[PDB]
């Protein structure tokens, strides 16, 4: 019951999907062999949200790995937890994507799509009562942005009732891995507005600060950031997988969050995060968590919520704790700092809790908040786009794939009406 | 095979018997048809 199915589109999607399944597999105590070697019966209770039984008591993930450039699907096949996926759920292409949204969305996408949809339905029927899909994108490249949204605009017509997430990694304002990056963003945003119910936005920058300020890490590797992303993705479905004195399915978390079908760009933050030095000075209490999560540092997206105004928010706690303390705390926030919250929403938080913490901790928490400072992101990408698009820089690459120029203006204006919805709704 | 005997006799050499002649500066036959389109004219301004 409440079955999910997990997509992993692109190099990033195929590299952070490694970490996500290395977190869950540990949480349900299954060896890299796949066999279950946990302790309690609480693991085997709701394992079917993410896995499928196989002979001899072995659970394989219901994941879907799509990516061009098979040079990554040897890495996942050689990683420690790589021998658990089905060999069928590996849809690759011997051709590269070239960091080009067009060919990822027009030519090379278009032949892989059906070869992926043949897979997704082979595990959209394996479900008893499907909860919904979830994806891990990277809005810079061509595989995650071209084939990513193209896969979505197909999932939406065959399963519109269900609920699809988006853990989209967005481009960075100061860090620029590639040069064409603005184009692959806007043309992809124009797809998320119409075919996504929820979409958290993550940037490598806030991922770098939290890795340098809070975690005080000396060498933040990419395998370390994804330990943060994989920490929050597992933090959503704690209610789906474990009992809790106030459980919250994934659907009831969306309705309490997006007032209108378009403002589905969220902002996340995990707690607690502490160096191996301050583990000596810290106390494991609830006021410690709620102070750290409401901070403007855990915001894994590099937007400052003190510039906007929270429409709604959330909190998903884990660990046997007092259900009043978590309510009076969130009650104080709206009352002390009562300017960063809208007026036409009287109570704009939701609070859940689960009896089962992470494997190695005793208490944790997790944050989601739909702010209006998120428009600062869509402003930044809309300055660099209209800068180089004005002179048709790097345009012959996109139009060679059959694209045209209106495909840019539409995608641009569709960001302008969007960046004002967040503004008119933000009455200071 | 050579020439018959007595036919390799020396001949008279005029002035400028062996002198190349510039045909003319003239438009060539084929411009070879460039494949790549030109650079835009810095004033298209398609963004709106
Ligand atoms: N958190 C995280 N981000 C990554 C990782 N690898 C790539 N990214 C980002 O992914 C962006 C480009 O997308 P990429 O997945 O590498 O190529 P694509 O397959 O064409 O989408 C770049 O901006 C990278 O910084 C990773 O391992 N972890």
Curated annotation (Swiss-Prot), chain A:
It is found in: Cytoplasm, Cytoskeleton. The gene is TUBB1. Tubulin is the major constituent of microtubules, a cylinder consisting of laterally associated linear protofilaments composed of alpha- and beta-tubulin heterodimers. Microtubules grow by the addition of GTP-tubulin dimers to the microtubule end, where a stabilizing cap forms. Below the cap, tubulin dimers are in GDP-bound state, owing to GTPase activity of alpha-tubulin. Gene3D superfamilies: Helix hairpin bin, Tubulin/FtsZ, C-terminal domain, Tubulin/FtsZ, GTPase domain. GO terms for cellular component: cytoplasm; microtubule. Belongs to the tubulin family. GTP binds at residues 11, 69, 138, 142-144, 204, 226. This is Tubulin beta-1/beta-2 chain. The lineage of its organism: Eukaryota, Viridiplantae, Chlorophyta, core chlorophytes, Chlorophyceae. Dimer of alpha and beta chains. A typical microtubule is a hollow water-filled tube with an outer diameter of 25 nm and an inner diameter of 15 nM. Alpha-beta heterodimers associate head-to-tail to form protofilaments running lengthwise along the microtubule wall with the beta-tubulin subunit facing the microtubule plus end conferring a structural polarity. Microtubules usually have 13 protofilaments but different protofilament numbers can be found in some organisms and specialized cells. InterPro entries: Beta-tubulin_BS, Beta_tubulin, Tub_FtsZ_C, Tubulin, Tubulin/FtsZ-like_C, Tubulin/FtsZ_2-layer-sand-dom, Tubulin/FtsZ_GTPase_sf, Tubulin_C. Its cofactor is Mg(2+).
